[PDB]
Amino acid sequence: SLKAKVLETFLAKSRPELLEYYIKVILDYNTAHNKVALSECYTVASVAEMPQNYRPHPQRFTYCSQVLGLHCYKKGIHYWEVELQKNNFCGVGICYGSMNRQGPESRLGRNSASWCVEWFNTKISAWHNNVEKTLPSTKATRVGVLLNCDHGFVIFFAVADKVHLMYKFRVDFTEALYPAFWVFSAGATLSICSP
Amino acid sequence: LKAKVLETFLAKSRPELLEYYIKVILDYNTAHNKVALSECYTVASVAEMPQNYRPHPQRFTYCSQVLGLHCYKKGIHYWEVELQKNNFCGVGICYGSMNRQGPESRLGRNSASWCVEWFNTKISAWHNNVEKTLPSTKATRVGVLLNCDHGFVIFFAVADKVHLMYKFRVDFTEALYPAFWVFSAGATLSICS
Amino acid sequence: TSLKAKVLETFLAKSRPELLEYYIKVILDYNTAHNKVALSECYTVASVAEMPQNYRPHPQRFTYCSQVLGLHCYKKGIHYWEVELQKNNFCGVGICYGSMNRQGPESRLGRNSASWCVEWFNTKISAWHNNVEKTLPSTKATRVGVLLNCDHGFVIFFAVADKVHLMYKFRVDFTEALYPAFWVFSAGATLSICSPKYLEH
Amino acid sequence: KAKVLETFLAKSRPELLEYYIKVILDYNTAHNKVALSECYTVASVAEMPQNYRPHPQRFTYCSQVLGLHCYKKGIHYWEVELQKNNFCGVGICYGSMNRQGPESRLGRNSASWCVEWFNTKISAWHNNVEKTLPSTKATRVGVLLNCDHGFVIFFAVADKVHLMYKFRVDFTEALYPAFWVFSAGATLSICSP
Amino acid sequence: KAKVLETFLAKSRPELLEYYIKVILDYNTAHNKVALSECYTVASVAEMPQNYRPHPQRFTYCSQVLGLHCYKKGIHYWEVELQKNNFCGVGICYGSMNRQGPESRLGRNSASWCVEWFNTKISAWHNNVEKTLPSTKATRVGVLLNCDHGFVIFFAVADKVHLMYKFRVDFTEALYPAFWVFSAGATLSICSPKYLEHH
Amino acid sequence: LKAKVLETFLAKSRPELLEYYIKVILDYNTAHNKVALSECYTVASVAEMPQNYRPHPQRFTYCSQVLGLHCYKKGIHYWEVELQKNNFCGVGICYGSMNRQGPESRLGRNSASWCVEWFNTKISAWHNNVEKTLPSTKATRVGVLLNCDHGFVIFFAVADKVHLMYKFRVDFTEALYPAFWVFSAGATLSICSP
């Protein structure tokens, strides 16, 4: 009975209710690891068949096959959707801009600055600050991320014929959040959804 | 390539032209070492310092140029570029087959491109290394209308009203990319919305 | 050494893209500018004016030397900033303590214990601290990078061309905050705080 | 000579606490301006002078107080918490330091060594020679006194331990912890709990 | 022969100064946007149109100016000082070269040869044919015009002297020195080399 | 004695200083590589391009300086220098023994040299790397009186009349050379005639 009443509302929402909060997300070429290929107007992230030799840049992940969106949000309510190739290792999440770009601890969910849902093939996890949380398998090839910066939470939704809670974190976000993407297996691809 | 349709286009206002709007985005792989991209791949600007972009066969190695990602062989397409008032830049179109090396790669200096060029105040139109002097204009915006159905491109000076700058009737032999040229300290092209 | 000497060798070996990890916007402060220094392009450019600017008297304002400071100072963290300069002119790029005297020739950057600078004079380059000069090799570079480390107490002046190159450095355990400091003193002389296009806008 | 200084200079907090001492403040030394609280662990500046009984031990000029015990042999470490944005000093003195006149101020005489906060600016003092020190976020100072090899070290205590300053002296008599509180909000708390 | 040209390519500053001549800018030829200063020694881009009287010899379209004198025989060497980051051009035209239309731009006709600074990029231009030259830090160019053996050399002039480009040509008339300046900042200064004597 | 004679020279008119006139001519072996000599060894001007002067132990390798041919250990000597209004330049005296290398060879930055310096509009007096700020002046000409007998040098500003800029009392230990310093584009020093 505080603003957990807002959280309880958002967890109940249908697709058409979440699409009210739709944002365009465009991948930031400066952040992409050498192993991550950008395509379809910077909309699709895939494991390139060989490392890409991108220029050095303070924004660029040097260690983990990761890439960030261009825009960050420190206020308002934002929803985006990402289609996954089934039977692959990838992650979809959010991170502070101050998240490290170097080291094994730059891995999405392996630090305090990042929050994600992983697929190791069929098995699904939620991660934050190097705590894993095993979840029920889903056949859904699409995740919806709802970030509420006004009332400090994020929700990961599996999106099929309907929409089902995968996980959520309440946090007092200390700075703006960037959409974050992780691709690992040869065949991994994360497509940001446009219409 | 109908003579009647072309007259229709030349008489169209902005709102009539905006009917064929496409969203153009700059192709990071084409931008020259001294052209920075910004505002979500929307703005091209001359950089004093090298950007050290990777080698790529698509990359302009000599002229301060960058292409869109998408080309067009059918239909009708319109896009706008805002330019810095007192600067040196070119807005045009080119075949993907256009050379990326040497002075031959300069927009309007080869068979593969058509463009309108600002030299501070001295406006020109170019194709196959042939220049045409055009009147000055205060307009800081050009609209490109590409008609791949009836093979013509029109360059419009966009201000309070729309005014013709030049046009090229051509039986296009492959797809056109939007093409951008910026070559002076402080020179920028911004694709509009 | 072991820890303060090795974190310095790491910063000394850094490239431009690595140095830009620590980039900070610097704004020139109209309250500090000598009467003969005009500010322009949103307090980004310092030039000699032919004719006085008639600024508000201010205790922080340089009365003798054609100098100006940035608005913000730094007592922790790692800060990089880049200054474009005109070729054949008299100018200096530096840091100082807020406590630095604003009057007299003593207030000239590097001529006192509260300031450290690199200085272009005629065609020759010198590092100054505490009125001690060090001759530097001439460079074609028309851009200087200042790396200030307030966590481990050193400042590095880089010549920024196609690569970065060491001009000079100072270790000092800093006793207060450092302000970016600028000197311009020839009819045409100008310094420009860069907004590197390498970084997002 | 000095190799034992270098060892102590390198020590971490848990290696210093090997030499920990309880320090209690002496009610008889305390100036009228200094209030004493907790269990004679805390020196604050009273809202009004306290009117303590006269006593040969009592500071009559400077707002100062000593610990009960003194040390002429062994190695001793203690920590004091301060309010960050105030005027205060933490040191050691000879029992023979004057309790009278402007000369009795901590560090203004050959009989005392301390570290001083003038709000944000930090100084070390001895024999009325001020030395300007690096400012730090530390709200705690650690005093290591080695009477055996004749030096004192003041450490800033935060997450880690940073040198503020040290003095090499052939100490000619026992040393008392010494405390100066000046500004209305000034507070020095001796650490155990 | 080609031997006389091998000797001039190999000449140093001191050897080339043997043929120094004073160039003065011809205030009758200067486009309305080309201010002359310091006794017809400096060509800059005027902020306002300079309101010269019309004249048939005057440049109507291009920001261009010629020397007073031309040269049909002998050996001549001059030095122009330029500002680093500007559109500018240094060369030689026949007097018969056109003053009107974009055919009048230096290097964009058969009447002229030049070396051009396209901000950072350096070109040699003859008869609307462009050749690409390595970038130099040099802010001074040396034209050596040998009328007697038909060639012109453009030298970059810094601590030593470096070839930029040369043209062989059996010239058919008198060559004027020719200057192009086109950007707010642009200035060309005809040098009075201090190596030589002022008394 | 050394102060009564000093007062007599401070009170002298221009014509009375020209009693002690010397022709000063520039020494080609001392001229820095970017210092050109012109008008029969009378004008020192900053050169953009190196002049390729032969190596010489007497030549200034860092500072844009040049000395006169002759030095003086006895007598009273007066010469004048015309400066460019808004420029960077120095006029002084120095020992033969003054360094010709490095920043320490700069006029007035060593114990072997005394000068008056223009930094555009800021006038200074220098000796042994000690600066005395001086009032500015519209005068574009300095007159140097060197008294080697009573051991003092005066720097006069010369316009319609003559005004003290500064004076140094020295027990001079060796001969004094006229010293010149030009350090900006288009800076020139001119040694005046009758």
UniProtKB/Swiss-Prot annotation, chain B:
Primary gene name: TRIM25
Assembly description: Forms homodimers. Interacts (via SPRY domain) with RIGI (via CARD domain). Interacts with ZFHX3. Interacts with NLRP12; this interaction reduces the E3 ubiquitin ligase TRIM25-mediated 'Lys-63'-linked RIGI activation. Interacts with the KHDC3L/FILIA-OOEP/FLOPED scaffold complex and BLM at DNA replication forks. Interacts with RTN3; this interaction prevents RIGI ubiquitination. Interacts with YWHAE. (Microbial infection) Interacts (via coiled coil) with influenza A virus NS1 protein; this interaction specifically inhibits TRIM25 multimerization and TRIM25-mediated RIGI CARD ubiquitination, thereby suppressing RIGI signal transduction.
Region of the whole protein represented: 436 to 628 of 630
Modified residues (N6-acetyllysine): K132
Organism: Homo sapiens
Post-translational note: Auto-ISGylated.
Entry comment describing in which tissues the protein is expressed: Expressed in breast tumors (at protein level). Ubiquitous.
Record-given protein name: E3 ubiquitin/ISG15 ligase TRIM25
Induction note: By interferons.
Role: Functions as a ubiquitin E3 ligase and as an ISG15 E3 ligase. Involved in innate immune defense against viruses by mediating ubiquitination of RIGI and IFIH1. Mediates 'Lys-63'-linked polyubiquitination of the RIGI N-terminal CARD-like region and may play a role in signal transduction that leads to the production of interferons in response to viral infection. Mediates 'Lys-63'-linked polyubiquitination of IFIH1. Promotes ISGylation of 14-3-3 sigma (SFN), an adapter protein implicated in the regulation of a large spectrum signaling pathway. Mediates estrogen action in various target organs.
Lineage: Eukaryota, Metazoa, Chordata, Craniata, Vertebrata
Note on domains (UniProt): The RING-type zinc finger is important for ISG15 E3 ligase activity and autoISGylation. AutoISGylation negatively regulates ISG15 E3 ligase activity.
Domain B30.2/SPRY stretches: 4-193
Subcellular location: Cytoplasm; Cytoplasm, Stress granule; Nucleus
Swiss-Prot record, chain C:
Reported induction: By interferons.
Reported function: Functions as a ubiquitin E3 ligase and as an ISG15 E3 ligase. Involved in innate immune defense against viruses by mediating ubiquitination of RIGI and IFIH1. Mediates 'Lys-63'-linked polyubiquitination of the RIGI N-terminal CARD-like region and may play a role in signal transduction that leads to the production of interferons in response to viral infection. Mediates 'Lys-63'-linked polyubiquitination of IFIH1. Promotes ISGylation of 14-3-3 sigma (SFN), an adapter protein implicated in the regulation of a large spectrum signaling pathway. Mediates estrogen action in various target organs.
Modification sites for N6-acetyllysine: K134
Name of the protein in its database record: E3 ubiquitin/ISG15 ligase TRIM25
Free-text comment on this protein's domains from its UniProt entry: The RING-type zinc finger is important for ISG15 E3 ligase activity and autoISGylation. AutoISGylation negatively regulates ISG15 E3 ligase activity.
Posttranslational modification: Auto-ISGylated. (Microbial infection) Autoubiquitinated; promoted by Epstein-Barr virus protein BPLF1.
Range of the intact protein held here: 434 to 630 of 630
Domain B30.2/SPRY residue range list: 6-197
Localisation per UniProt entry: Cytoplasm; Cytoplasm, Stress granule; Nucleus
Molecular function in Gene Ontology: cadherin binding; ligase activity; RIG-I binding; RNA binding; transcription coactivator activity; ubiquitin protein ligase activity; ubiquitin-protein transferase activity; zinc ion binding
Gene Ontology cellular component list: cytoplasm; cytoplasmic stress granule; cytosol; nuclear body; nucleoplasm
GO BP annotation list: antiviral innate immune response; cellular response to leukemia inhibitory factor; cytoplasmic pattern recognition receptor signaling pathway; ERAD pathway; host-mediated suppression of symbiont invasion; innate immune response; positive regulation of canonical NF-kappaB signal transduction; positive regulation of DNA-binding transcription factor activity
Main localization (coarse): cytoplasm
Tissue specificity annotation: Expressed in breast tumors (at protein level). Ubiquitous.
From Swiss-Prot, chain D:
Modified residues (N6-acetyllysine): K131
Induction (record text): By interferons.
Post-translation changes: Auto-ISGylated.
Free-text tissue specificity from the UniProt record: Expressed in breast tumors (at protein level). Ubiquitous.
Annotated B30.2/SPRY domain residues: 3-193
Principal place of residence: cytoplasm
Biological process annotations from GO: antiviral innate immune response; cellular response to leukemia inhibitory factor; cytoplasmic pattern recognition receptor signaling pathway; ERAD pathway; host-mediated suppression of symbiont invasion; innate immune response; positive regulation of canonical NF-kappaB signal transduction; positive regulation of DNA-binding transcription factor activity
Molecular function in Gene Ontology: cadherin binding; ligase activity; RIG-I binding; RNA binding; transcription coactivator activity; ubiquitin protein ligase activity; ubiquitin-protein transferase activity; zinc ion binding
Keywords, ordered alphabetically: Acetylation, Antiviral defense, Coiled coil, Cytoplasm, Host-virus interaction, Immunity, Innate immunity, Isopeptide bond, Ligase, Metal-binding, Nucleus, Phosphoprotein, Transferase, Ubl conjugation, Ubl conjugation pathway, Zinc, Zinc-finger
Location relative to the cell: Cytoplasm; Cytoplasm, Stress granule; Nucleus
GO cellular component terms given for this protein: cytoplasm; cytoplasmic stress granule; cytosol; nuclear body; nucleoplasm
Subunit structure: Forms homodimers. Interacts (via SPRY domain) with RIGI (via CARD domain). Interacts with ZFHX3. Interacts with NLRP12; this interaction reduces the E3 ubiquitin ligase TRIM25-mediated 'Lys-63'-linked RIGI activation. Interacts with the KHDC3L/FILIA-OOEP/FLOPED scaffold complex and BLM at DNA replication forks. Interacts with RTN3; this interaction prevents RIGI ubiquitination. Interacts with YWHAE.
Record text about domains: The RING-type zinc finger is important for ISG15 E3 ligase activity and autoISGylation. AutoISGylation negatively regulates ISG15 E3 ligase activity.
Official protein name in the record: E3 ubiquitin/ISG15 ligase TRIM25
